[PDB]
Amino acid sequence: PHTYIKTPTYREPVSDYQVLREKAASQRRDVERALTRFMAKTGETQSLFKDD
Amino acid sequence: KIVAYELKTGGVLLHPIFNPASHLHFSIKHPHTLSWEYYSMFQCKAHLVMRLIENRISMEFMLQVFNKLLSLASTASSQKFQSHMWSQMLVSTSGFLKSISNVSGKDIQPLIKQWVDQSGVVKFYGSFAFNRKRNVLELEIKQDYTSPGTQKYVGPLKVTVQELDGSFNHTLQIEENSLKHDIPCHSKSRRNKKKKIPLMNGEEVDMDLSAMDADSPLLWIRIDPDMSVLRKVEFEQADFMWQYQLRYERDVVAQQESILALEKFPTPASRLALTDILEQEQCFYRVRMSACFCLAKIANSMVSTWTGPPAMKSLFTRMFCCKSCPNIVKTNNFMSFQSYFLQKTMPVAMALLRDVHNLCPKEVLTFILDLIKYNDNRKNKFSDNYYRAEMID
């Protein structure tokens, strides 16, 4: 029945609470790190260390 | 607060007579020469002495005193005579004591003479011994009255003894030459049969009596339980008595003082007592918040004996994390207001853990950083600023 019949398939769904918590956490941390580095680079900046 | 301030520098003198207080570097004749810490401790001591006057003369008579003062003032407040009657709106000490004596028939002049006119707090050092032969409890209460902030107490003193037959109150007369006070003790027939031991309130509980002495019935002793004097108590119980007082007492100040006294006994039974307090809802939440820091101190003192994980970590994952993921914290729902306070105070105490090398372990620091990363607050009706601020702490 490659010759007379057929049926569709789908992509593998990731319904796991652990990896969904990890994905949302890491994406939130990365976007807030990118935002704060962009705003500290395009403005007046301070530094805990000398010339940092 | 007041016993710390009065033992630190001199004492607060309510109602001075015009210097009356020369132990301190400012003059107490005017409010604008007082130190600000003295002003704060003045208001604090004034409301505690009013609680003492309520203890001697009951609360309904106290509210009748206040209503009589307000009623004289409000009959005064409507006249037009220029102060023939407008000075009934001004209270004095003699007028207040006279109104108290009018409504109650008792005068409080010894209590006023001790706690108002005299400027000192008392220090109690207690130690007991149980006489098995005559079945008595020999208390030994001595006062430190030679410190700069202290004074000598000669009144009566309440003591509450929890024995196997229940909770009994005793009044002791502590004169100047007194040292040994023999009070009688009851049976120990609730160790013959397993019966429940009745508490300070009407209830009764099952206690594990394996830690108790075989010859003594008494489970714990509390000197001045109702805080009826301005005092600092230093009682010498045994560590199992402090653990029984932490577990089964129905008074929050006794649970707090047993937490404070269990830091000197780092035995694993005290760790079990504080961990059972921490796991226990229907305990007052500010006792569990103190048991966190007490458990951290005890855990720091019994390194090279601690068996499993660091303290409170497994308990945090049992109470506040997911069942399927132990290292992922649950999403924030702060609607309980007691597990919110306990959740935001438990890593702050957990970070005071130290290893054998005096460095914080990388299992607790990693746990705190995972608490910070996996924090999701898009679902509760409350803000997250104090919990995140405590995470930084």
> Per-residue DSSP letters for B271-294?
HHHHHHHHT-BTB-HHHHHHHHHH
Instruction: Kindly provide the b/e burial profile for residues B169-188, where b requires at least 16 CB atoms within 10 angstroms of the residue's own CB.
Output: eeebebeeeeeebebebeeb
Q: Tally Cβ neighbours within 10 Å of residue A34.
A: 10
Token pair listed for B361: 């372990």
Q: Provide DSSP, B326-373.
A: SSSBPPP---SSSHHHHHHHHHHHHTT---TTSS--HHHHHHHHHHHH
Q: B324 touching A, CB under 8 A? A: yes
- Which has the closest alpha carbon to B294: B278, B318, B315, B305? B278
Which chain A residues contact residue B328 at CB under 8 A? 18, 21-22
Distance (Å, whole) CA B114 – CA B148: 16
C-alpha–C-alpha distance, residues B234 and B65, integer Å: 36
Tokens of B2: 């007041």
CB within 8 Å: A17 and B374: no
Chain B residues within an 8 Å CB radius of A31? none
Q: Chain A: which residues have CB within 8 Å of chain B?
A: 17-18, 21-22, 24-26, 29
Which of A17, A18, A29 has its CB closest to that of B373?
A29
| Spatial contact of B26 and B36, defined as CB atoms under 8 Å apart | no
**Whole-angstrom distance between the N-terminal and C-terminal Cα of chain A?**
68
Alpha-carbon distance A51 to B340, whole Å?
41
Which chain B residues contact residue A17 at CB under 8 A? 322, 324-325
The tokens describing B241, both together, are 């008595």
Burial of residue B157, with CB atoms counted within 10 A of its CB: 0-12 exposed, 13-18 middle, 19 or more buried: buried
Strands B166-173 and B122-131: unpaired
Cα dihedral: B299, B303, B309, B310 (round 10): 40
DSSP calls for B7-53: HHSS---SS-------SSSS-SSSGGGS-HHHHHHHHHHHHHHHHHH
The candidate with the shortest Cα–Cα distance to B295, out of B319, B318, B268, is B268
Query: Burial, B64: exposed, middle or buried (Cβ in 10 Å; 0-12, 13-18, 19+)?
Result: middle
Q: How far apart are CA B110 and CA B112, in angstroms?
A: 5
**Rounded CA gap, B332 and B80, in Å?**
62
CB-based contacts of B81, cutoff 8 Å, min separation 6: none
| Cα(B315)–Cα(B309) distance, integer angstroms | 10
The candidate with the shortest Cα–Cα distance to B331, out of A26, A27, A33, A17, is A17
Across B49-111, the runs of DSSP E, i.e. the strands, are none
Q: Do A21 and B374 touch (CB under 8 A)?
A: yes
CB B221 within 8 A of CB B161: yes
Pairing mode, strands B166-173 and B136-143: unpaired
Those residues with Cβ within 8 angstroms of residue B112's Cβ, 6 or more apart along the chain or in another chain? B97
**Interatomic CA distance for residues B215 and B130, integer angstroms:** 9
Residue in chain A closest to B331 (alpha carbons) equals A21
d(CA B51, CA B47): 6
- Shortest Cα distance, chain B CAs vs residue A51, angstroms: 25
Sheet of strand B136-143, all strands in order from the earlier edge strand to the far edge:
B180-184, B136-143, B122-131, B231-236
Please answer yes or no on whether B325 and A29 come within 8 Å at the CB atom. Answer: no
Q: Are B361 and B342 in contact (CB under 8 A)?
A: no
Count residue pairs from A and B with Cβ separation < 8 A: 17
Q: At what angle do helices B339-350 and B362-373 cross, to 10 degrees?
A: 140
Q: Minimal CA–CA distance to B392: which of B351, B335, B334?
A: B351
CA gap B190, B209 in Å, rounded: 10
* Helix count and strand count (H, E) for chain A: 1, 0
> Interhelix angle for B252-261 vs B285-301, to 10°?
10
**What dihedral do alpha carbons B19, B24, B30, B31 form, nearest 10°?**
-160
B232: amino acid identity, one letter: K
Structure tokens at A32: 């807030």
**Spatial contact of B368 and B347, defined as CB atoms under 8 Å apart:** yes
> Could you tell me which residues are beta bridge partners of residue B125?
B142, B234
| Angle ∠(B262,B390,B37) on CA atoms, nearest 5 | 70
Per DSSP, the three-state class of B159 is strand
C-alpha distances (whole Å) from B107 to each of B110, B118, B310 are: 8, 18, 58
For residue B162, list its beta bridge partners: B167, B220
Answer whether B369 touches A (CB < 8 Å). Answer: no
Q: Which of B242, B160, B164 is closest to B198 using CA atoms?
A: B164
Resolution in A, one decimal? 9.0
CA distances from B305 to B13, B209, B239, B243, B266 (A): 50, 25, 19, 20, 11
Q: Does B373 touch chain A (CB under 8 A)?
A: yes
Cβ distance B373 to A25 less than 8 Å, yes or no, reads yes
Distance between A27 CA and the closest CA of chain B, angstroms? 10
Chain B residues in contact with A15 by the CB 8 A cut-off are none
**What are the φ/ψ torsions at residue B5 (nearest 5 degrees)?**
-70, -40
B185, B163 Cβ separation under 8 angstroms:
yes
Task: Write the single-letter amino acid at B325.
Answer: C
Q: Under 8 Å CB-to-CB from B317, ≥6 apart: which residues? A: B326, B327
Long-range contacts of B13-16 (CB under 8 A, 24+ apart): B13/B117, B13/B118, B13/B119, B14/B42, B14/B45, B14/B46, B14/B49, B14/B115, B14/B116, B14/B117, B14/B119, B15/B93, B15/B116, B15/B117
- CA distance linking residue B163 with residue B180, whole number of Å: 20
Give residue B10's Cα distance to chain centre.
Answer: 23
CA distance B382 to chain A (A): 20
Record: contact A18-B374, CB cut-off 8 A: no
Written as one letter, the residue type at B148 is: P
